[PDB]
Amino acid sequence: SSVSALKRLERSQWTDKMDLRFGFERLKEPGEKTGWLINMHPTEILDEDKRLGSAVDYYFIQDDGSRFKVALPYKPYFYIATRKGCEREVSSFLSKKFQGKIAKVETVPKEDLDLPNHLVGLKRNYIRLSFHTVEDLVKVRKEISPAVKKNREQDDQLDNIVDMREYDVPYHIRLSIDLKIHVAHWYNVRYRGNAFPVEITRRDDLVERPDPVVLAFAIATTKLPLKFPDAETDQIMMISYMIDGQGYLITNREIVSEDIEDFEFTPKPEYEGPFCVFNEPDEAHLIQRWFEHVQETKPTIMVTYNGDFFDWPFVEARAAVHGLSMQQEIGFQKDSQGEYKAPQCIHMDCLRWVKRDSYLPVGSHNLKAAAKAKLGYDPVELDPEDMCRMATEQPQTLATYSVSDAVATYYLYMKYVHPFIFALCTIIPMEPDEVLRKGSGTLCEALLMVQAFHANIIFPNKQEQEFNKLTDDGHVLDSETYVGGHVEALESGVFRSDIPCRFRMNPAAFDFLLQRVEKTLRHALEEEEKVPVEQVTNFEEVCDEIKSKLASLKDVPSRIECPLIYHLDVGAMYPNIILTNRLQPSAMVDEATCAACDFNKPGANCQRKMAWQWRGEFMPASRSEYHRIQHQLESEKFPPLFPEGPARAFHELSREEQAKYEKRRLADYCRKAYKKIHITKVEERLTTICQRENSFYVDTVRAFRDRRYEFKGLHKVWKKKLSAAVEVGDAAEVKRCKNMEVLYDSLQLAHKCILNSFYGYVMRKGARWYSMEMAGIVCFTGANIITQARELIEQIGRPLELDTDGIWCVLPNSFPENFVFKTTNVKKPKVTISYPGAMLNIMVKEGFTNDQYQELAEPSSLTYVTRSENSIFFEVDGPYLAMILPASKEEGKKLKKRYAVFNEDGSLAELKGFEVKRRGELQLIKIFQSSVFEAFLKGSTLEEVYGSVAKVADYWLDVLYSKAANMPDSELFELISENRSMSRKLEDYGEQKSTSISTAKRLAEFLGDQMVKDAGLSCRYIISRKPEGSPVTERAIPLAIFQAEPTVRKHFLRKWLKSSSLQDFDIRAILDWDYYIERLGSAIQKIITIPAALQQVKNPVPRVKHPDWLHKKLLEKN
DNA sequence: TCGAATCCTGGATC
DNA sequence: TTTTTATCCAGGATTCGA
Ligand SMILES: Nc1ncnc2c1ncn2[C@H]1CC[C@@H](COP(=O)(O)OP(=O)(O)OP(=O)(O)O)O1
Ligand code: SF4
Ligand SMILES: [Ca+2]
């Protein structure tokens, strides 16, 4: 014990002296102060009995820049349940048995949503146990739970206790939940000495955030040519940073051959970036100066791009070589999870945001690309191997490179990252860096814990994972799942609003539409717009125009017209599907509970039934065959946990080992004994949703939905006010307005992020509120909605592309489009409607609306009032100028999820899926695909368009047939090389073979394991001819070899090309040109020529032949 | 000996 | 002690049937 006690006191006193050094004095004096809460960390402190107890530190920062700490003592606890009447006997036994370790025990009636017949108002007694310290809590937990495990498996006093709950919420989460303390608010803190607990009370009238000191830093180092750096070998060359918009540079005058003057680097007036420079004689003085300047300026946020991977481990390892210690000078230390942390300031890494919340493609995750897109300028680059000569040859262009990435890290953090995390913390009980690092499911669970606590619900336990469960007909399941979203790719080629197109249409559909126009217009005005139809005067003229247009269409259905291209999209579909049906993870019920519920009377209306599709995958072996395989394990012997350990018996396997050994036997036996390894069985089920259950989940979803639109509105209002303030030109008003704009923008994004999170959480393994039914019923109802939206549109027009929530289509030029009504409302003198929207919203209204919605009108009365609700509405984007869809090289298929679209202005609207955006992909194909889509805008008819794109492909085929005749050799390498990336370490692929693995081994052979050592490797290779007939995986040759020393390059090529006397090693001699020609060929086909053959034009490029199935079909049709 | 189907991985679209 | 799902493309290799 005493070792633990003194360890805890030692670390507490060290941390308290460290944060005292940075100025976070503890609040000492009787009095009241106010401050913005910025951080919290758990700590233990002595009580009036001189006994340790658990506490939490709160860190406050004041308006004037002063800072203070406060410690709040609080006792952790958990709940247990007992059989009839046992609570007095059990609590007395508990208190005598664990005497001195458990502080208090008490009986509490809790409302648990799983109690049979609970809707009448019953609830059950849980005993609470509360402890002096979490150290003592864990021991009693471990003494208790072995009896609960046996009691649960069946279902003295200790035998009687039947369950335990809430035993695994973290201590600071529990404290933030229970006392409602949240970060980025303003508080009053009232202190009275040890005589009484310190009191913290929020005040909502202070709105301006303070401005914490932010430091952003980057480092540059030496390394050996053509190899990765390592901290035992390589010195640091320079370190550069910004603090609150002033920049500094430190330079090592060993390597760098001259002093560097001070200078300004300013990408745009938005980013001033002044820098001031210190020249130091040694690495040790360079590293001394940085720690001195941090201890001087005492930052509260430290930021660096991907610093946890390289920069921090490097500057730590280089400090140890000079007898300094980062953990004593600064205070940062590497946690068990391999991430740096400190008590006194927060380490925020932009790349955890870029990777989670930006919706950039992985190709754009490179720092300079992210800056290019988000900040709209190009930084400068140096080739990583020229830096070491540049340092001697021309120092200041290296300094100019080194600055650019500090500047870009600082302004990227300030603009995008900073408002988002400090907005998102205002609604979630977590630390800022936890909120950044944690997954969105964990962010979404704590919120429901907060909402369940105040409703006095008791948290359910985490979900138990089943292993190798049986199908209900006795077959072991490898999986369970639900069928997801629906996709179709109906048509291919080029659609342009500039060229005629042929339509054929059902006149009874136009008649059906014309017969109901007024319903659709009324419903679109009253229910969506919320303008009563009596307030509009010109209504009948608009209906006369719409009817006469439909009548004109109904006479002549088959026609040639220019197209109109429309996208129709459901807004926030899945939340609205939840809100409309009252789906809740607890609300799904079986026959057995309804049979017990007193409301289950004839004429009750509470049972709503909905359908979903289950899809198991199961093995062919029978139950008895599996059980005989298990019996064959009853006598088996197994290897030890480690080579020194004794051989294990079957009960000494873990349940995961037993499961995997049963999988190994059962799969192998099935493989031999049966023809195919598994069988699928898609199956239809129906599930009841109790309409009267407690509404806390759906009310949370609704509240977030409403707040998002409120903050969007205020954001647009304040942005307009910002434009007005900018025209006024007064800096104080502009600054105030900008602050309000950023506040509402960040709140709006936070609320969108949480709204989007609610769908994903309910399927997470281990989730407290988990169900599979609700997630399947949502996807199925969305698929029914989009199927009926396809069925309707196929008769009015032609759908082109259909996906999870929306449809692309063409409509005939004479279709109604948009109409403007005139209204007497003073705020709303005009209203504009689009007929394609109202046409579908009236279809959704009739089928989907829910007639059973109930709410409890008077909690004491047991009276519920029936309602109705329907929240699902379509909206209309566009129209667009042009739309180009590709086609498949196989006969019976078309490509889904790929297309391009252009705006009316000819600017690129969308370009989805194509290689032009993907990471690690062949540049020649990227440039081709880029140039063709811009070429489709040219020309004036299909035969002009297909004639005019062909000249872009014949340029590149002239290149590949010329072997780059004029092209200077430095261009060719980047044009031709791939750049694929390998996720796992080289061992972990095991037996698997691939071009990346095969070129990783080729790197190990060439440079040693000093390069394979870490994951996330990237491989650049060419593919080579000379090993004739050998499969392609063997011919990958690393690009690096073309920069090696001649005697190394020749030796290794002669080893790899198996060509002993080979005279020429020129890349033009080695390239397998006919591989690349057929890579280009299969892309030019799929874009230009197969779709052309689908639009009654001949092959527009002679050099590339059709596939034989198309050659037959064309020859026979001719 | 020759052709088709299944499998695995890295990365995108909703 | 952790951890959001499902549908789809392109490339390369291995096994079974005619
Ligand atoms: N990252 C993700 N994780 C899980 N499901 C996702 C997802 N992204 C999309 N989905 C699924 C679930 C939602 C669905 C997209 O349809 P909505 O209309 O709900 O989303 P949206 O178009 O973004 O909203 P709008 O801009 O119209 O307001 O795709
Ligand atoms: S659906 Fe009706 S009968 Fe069944 S549990 Fe709910 S309230 Fe009771
Ligand atoms: Ca949508």
Numbering used by the authors: 27 to 181, 213 to 1175
Sentences copied from the publication:
During chromosome replication, the nascent leading strand is synthesized by DNA polymerase epsilon (Pol ε), which associates with the sliding clamp processivity factor proliferating cell nuclear antigen (PCNA) to form a processive holoenzyme. For high-fidelity DNA synthesis, Pol ε relies on nucleotide selectivity and its proofreading ability to detect and excise a misincorporated nucleotide. For proofreading and mismatch excision, the 3′ end of the nascent strand must be partially melted from the template strand and guided toward the Pol ε exonuclease domain active site (exo site), which is located almost 40 Å away from the pol site. Our atomic model of human Pol ε cat closely resembles the crystal structure of the S. cerevisiae homolog, with an identical domain organization in the ‘right-hand’-shaped B-family DNA Pol fold consisting of an N-terminal domain (NTD) and the Palm, Exonuclease (Exo), Finger and Thumb domains.
To investigate how Pol ε detects and proofreads a misincorporated nucleotide, we repeated the reconstitution and structure elucidation using DNA that contained a T–C mismatch at the 3ʹ end of the nascent strand. The pol site harbors an incoming ddATP that forms a Watson–Crick base pair with the templating thymidine. Notably, we observe Pol ε only in the open conformation and extensive three-dimensional (3D) classification did not reveal any heterogeneity within the Finger domain. The absence of closed or partially closed states, despite the presence of a complementary nucleotide bound in the active site, suggests that the open conformation is favored when Pol ε is bound to a mismatch-containing substrate and may serve as a fidelity checkpoint after mismatch incorporation. The backbone of the nascent strand displays a subtle distortion at the T–C mismatch in the postinsertion site. The terminal cytosine base in the nascent strand is retracted from the templating thymidine and rotated toward the major groove. This increases the gap between the nucleobase faces and renders the base stacking with the incoming nucleotide imperfect. Most notable are the release of DNA coordination by R955 and of the interactions that Palm residues E858 and D860 form with Thumb residue K954. This rearrangement destabilizes the domain interface between Palm and Thumb, as well as the coordination of DNA near the pol site, which may serve as a trigger for subsequent conformational changes in the proofreading mechanism.
